[PDB]
Paper text:
To maintain lysogeny and prevent entry into the lytic replication cycle, temperate bacteriophages encode a repressor protein that binds specific operator sites in the phage genome to repress the transcription of genes required for lytic growth. A large group of mycobacteriophages code for repressors that are unusual in also terminating transcription elongation at numerous binding sites (stoperators) distributed across the phage genome. Here we present the X-ray crystal structure of a mycobacteriophage repressor from the cluster A bacteriophage TipsytheTRex bound to DNA. The structure reveals that the repressor monomer contains two DNA-binding domains, an N-terminal HTH and a second domain that is a variation of the HTH motif.
Author numbering: 15 to 181
The structure:
DNA sequence: TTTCGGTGGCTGTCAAGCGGG
DNA sequence: CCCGCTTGACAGCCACCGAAA
């Protein structure tokens, strides 16, 4: 009825732009079966996954619903890719607006898992505070709940040419 | 009009367990 | 054993909808 599902075949179909769920449907297995093969035999990681390896917090649901979480993810993606070529127009507009707001009001983002959601932060967990010098070029506040790796310092700082993109 | 938060469904990963060599 | 799967639970991702400039 077919050829047993190997990592190479899934990777080939991914290169062709198919995702793991569609591949699972193609081979009559669960997406988890497709994921296991990728996880077990070292399948390439997308930019988002790479950014995830260097994510600064132990977040849960429903933190993923806050706009700060989504915008910071988009920012990490931009710094990793280095241009907007892999982002939709919406991600670009929203990210630039977020940067402009963040820069002009001199704030950095802080995370504390005990803060409960409130109006304008539907996922809870995040809050904006004014930058002090220890923050340098970072868009984030380092606190007891932030684990920042060597790779992370590059991801969570402003781009060097940030002034040119805004006007 | 365009902008921005909130929301939902879909996507993907991990841990533990099962069955066929 | 191990290898390939599935079940269940949780975290993250991205465009659409509507109300507020």
């Amino acid at each position: 009825s077919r050829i047993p599902l190997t990592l190479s075949e899934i990777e080939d179909l991914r290169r062709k732009g198919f995702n793991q769920t569609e591949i699972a449907e193609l081979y009559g297995v669960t997406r988890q079966a497709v994921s296991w093969h990728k996880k077990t035999y070292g399948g390439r990681l997308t930019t988002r996954q790479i950014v995830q390896q260097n994510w600064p917090w132990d977040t849960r649901k429903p933190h993923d619903k806050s706009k700060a979480f989504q915008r910071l993810r988009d920012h990490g993606e931009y710094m990793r890719v280095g241009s907007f070529r892999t982002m939709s127009e919406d991600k670009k507009k929203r990210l630039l607006s977020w940067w402009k707001m963040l820069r002009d009001n001199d704030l950095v983002l802080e995370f504390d898992p005990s803060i409960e959601p409130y109006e304008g932060m539907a996922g809870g967990g995040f809050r904006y505070v004014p930058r002090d010098i220890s923050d340098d070029d970072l868009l984030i506040r380092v606190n007891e709940h932030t684990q920042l790796t060597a790779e992370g310092e590059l991801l969570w700082s402003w781009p060097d040419d940030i002034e040119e993109l805004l006007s």
